[PDB]
Every structure is written in structure tokens, then in C-alpha cells.
């Protein structure tokens, strides 16, 4: 994320463009993910758990628009 | 409390000057429901302080209160087993409550003979930043400033 300060662009607005360029490139998440070694078994396990619960969430939701609360 | 509905309580103004603030001061000085004693102490101290300052009663009061009122204090928030002194801005009602409490405590742990003269001398020293009450204000302010990094939870 290399933000150029543009003309008449005040500081706040360029700072916010930089924060979003970073949060979009995922610099911080990549850094946190590279702090400690993770065994391949743990990697495969967390990938599968995220897939299973995303799928279960979509399914529970699309049945939630078939139940009434009151 | 958890619920929250503390309707505030009616306090009469003081008879001599008609000030709710001075009545709060009498209440904070009062011991064992003996309000007549406390009122006689407060009026004697205020008359003495006004003669020794020339100003007026209910203005020398607010001048001594001004140099004791804290602006920011620290609340404890435990994070890692240990605690973080967190600076928090003091509400004006609490500003005056704490100023009065500190002034009374200071005037109590003084050396003059009667409580009226001790309170007068404490009020006089607070009007030029020399008593233990303004020392407590300064200590609280320096704690909050030494913890200013933690002005977040």
C-alpha cells in the first residue's frame, strides 16, 4: 500500500486512503499468520472448519427465512 | 446499581446564604446527623475566611473550591491479572463533591484548635495552592497524566 499525498487532499483523507489500502492488501493478517509455525494438520483443520461452518451458516440462514418468531 | 433509576434527592439551600453548594458542604462536614454543629462550624469558618481575605463568604468559598476541583482521575481496570489506572474525565458534580470531601479531610487532619479555624485555614491555603487538599488534587492529576497512555480500555 503506497499512497501518494494528492494536492489539496488534507492529511486525514490520505491517511484513511492508506488505512484502507493496507486493510485491503491484508498486511496485518498476513503478519499475524506468519508469527508462529502452524503444522499442516492444523492448517487443513482450520480451513475445513471454516468451510463447514460457512456452509452451515448459509443453510441455517436460508431456513431462517422459513421460520416465524412471533 | 445494575438496574439504574437513582432519582436525585432534594437538598435545601443553606439558610444564611441560600446556596445548595454550601449546604452540600455542611452535609459533607456533618458527623452523626448533628447538622446544627456543622452549620455553626461552616459559618464561623466562612466569616473568618472572609475577614482574612476581604472578598466575601460565598466567593472565597468558590475560590478555594476552584483550586481543589480535580479535572481527571484514574479508575482501575484489571487486564493481565494486574491493573491499569485508566484516566477518566471527572463530571462537574463529582468535581465539587471531591473538592469538598478533600477540603474537609484536610481541615480535619490539621493542627489548629477548633474545626472552624482549621477549616478557615485550609480554605485560605487552598485559595493559594498550599494545603494538603490541593496536594491531593496535584497527586491525582499527576497520576492521571502518568497513566495518559492508557486513556483507552
Amino acid at each position: 500500500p503506497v499512497i501518494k499525498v494528492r494536492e489539496n487532499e488534507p492529511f486525514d483523507v490520505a491517511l484513511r486512503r492508506f488505512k484502507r489500502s493496507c486493510e485491503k492488501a491484508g498486511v496485518l493478517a498476513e503478519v499475524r499468520r506468519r508469527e508462529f509455525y502452524e503444522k499442516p494438520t492444523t492448517e487443513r483443520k482450520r480451513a475445513k472448519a471454516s468451510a463447514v461452518k460457512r456452509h452451515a451458516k448459509k443453510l441455517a440462514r436460508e431456513n431462517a427465512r422459513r421460520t416465524r418468531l412471533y | 446499581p445494575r438496574r439504574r433509576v437513582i432519582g436525585q434527592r432534594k437538598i435545601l439551600p443553606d439558610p444564611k446564604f441560600g446556596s445548595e453548594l454550601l449546604a452540600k458542604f455542611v452535609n459533607i462536614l456533618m458527623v452523626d446527623g448533628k447538622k446544627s454543629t456543622a452549620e455553626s462550624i461552616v459559618y464561623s469558618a466562612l466569616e473568618t475566611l472572609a475577614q482574612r481575605s476581604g472578598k466575601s463568604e460565598l466567593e472565597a468559598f468558590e475560590v478555594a473550591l476552584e483550586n481543589v476541583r480535580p479535572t481527571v482521575e484514574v479508575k482501575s481496570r484489571r487486564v493481565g491479572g494486574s491493573t491499569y489506572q485508566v484516566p477518566v474525565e471527572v463530571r462537574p458534580v463529582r468535581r465539587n463533591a471531591l473538592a469538598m470531601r478533600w477540603i474537609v479531610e484536610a481541615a480535619r487532619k490539621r493542627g489548629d484548635k477548633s474545626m472552624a479555624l482549621r477549616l478557615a485555614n485550609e480554605l485560605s491555603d487552598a485559595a493559594e495552592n498550599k494545603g494538603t487538599a490541593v496536594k491531593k488534587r496535584e497527586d491525582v492529576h499527576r497520576m492521571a497524566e502518568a497513566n495518559k497512555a492508557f486513556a483507552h480500555y
Binding site: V2, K4, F11, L15, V27, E30, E35, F36 | K148, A149
Partner: protein, 117 residues
């Protein structure tokens, strides 16, 4: 002494500390400051306020170069990233650039083991 007026601000923002270094555009350190040397230890060193104060001090240190317009290289995941730049813009510099320079391996070396706490 010398006049440069176009500097680069390097912020090394770790979890534990913040290091602010101002150089010229050629990489020569004119001055520096750290959160841990600006009056902060342990639980305070790793806060955005300590980094802000470190950046204040590093701006105050390079005063006799007449630096006027700064580039900003941010490196690392620590708390002192945003606050340092918000204090460089304040201190008096005309921030012209903000880049992230966090090193990312494209695979790289095996990291240390996970902490069990």
C-alpha cells in the same frame, strides 16, 4: 548543521516497541527516537501514545536539518503505526507519502513454534 528538507520517516512498529527514524532520501539516519526510550517501559511502551511521543521526539531531534516534507515508511503490525504518522503531520512536516514496507516472505523461513499459554 546541514539542510536537506526532504526526508523519509521509517516507523518500525512491533508488538513490543516503536522505533522512529528520520533519514534523507538516500537512507542516512539524521535522527531517531523510540517509545521505550521516550519514558515508557513494559505495559506502556507498547501503546500508541508512547509511539506518538517517540515520533514527537524524533521530529524534535532532526530540527537542525530544516526538514520540511516527509515520506513515511511503515513496517510491522504493532500499535504504533497510525499514531506515529498522526504525530508527524502534527509536529510540522508536510507528509508527501505513506507506504507500508512490512517484509512478507513468498512461501521463506520456518517461523518459531506457537506459544502455549
Amino acid at each position: 548543521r546541514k539542510q536537506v528538507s526532504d526526508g523519509v520517516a521509517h516507523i518500525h512498529a512491533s508488538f513490543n516497541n516503536t522505533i522512529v527514524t528520520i533519514t534523507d532520501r538516500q537512507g542516512n539516519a539524521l535522527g531517531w527516537a523510540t517509545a521505550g526510550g521516550s519514558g515508557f517501559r513494559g505495559s506502556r511502551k507498547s501503546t500508541p501514545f508512547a509511539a506518538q511521543v517517540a515520533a514527537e521526539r524524533c521530529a524534535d531531534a532532526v530540527k537542525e536539518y530544516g526538514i520540511k516534507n516527509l515520506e513515511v515508511m511503515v513496517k510491522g503490525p504493532g500499535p504504533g503505526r497510525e499514531s506515529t504518522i498522526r504525530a508527524l503531520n502534527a509536529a510540522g512536516f508536510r507528509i508527501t507519502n505513506i507506504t507500508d514496507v512490512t517484509p512478507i516472505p513468498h512461501x521463506g523461513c520456518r517461523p518459531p513454534k506457537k506459544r502455549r499459554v
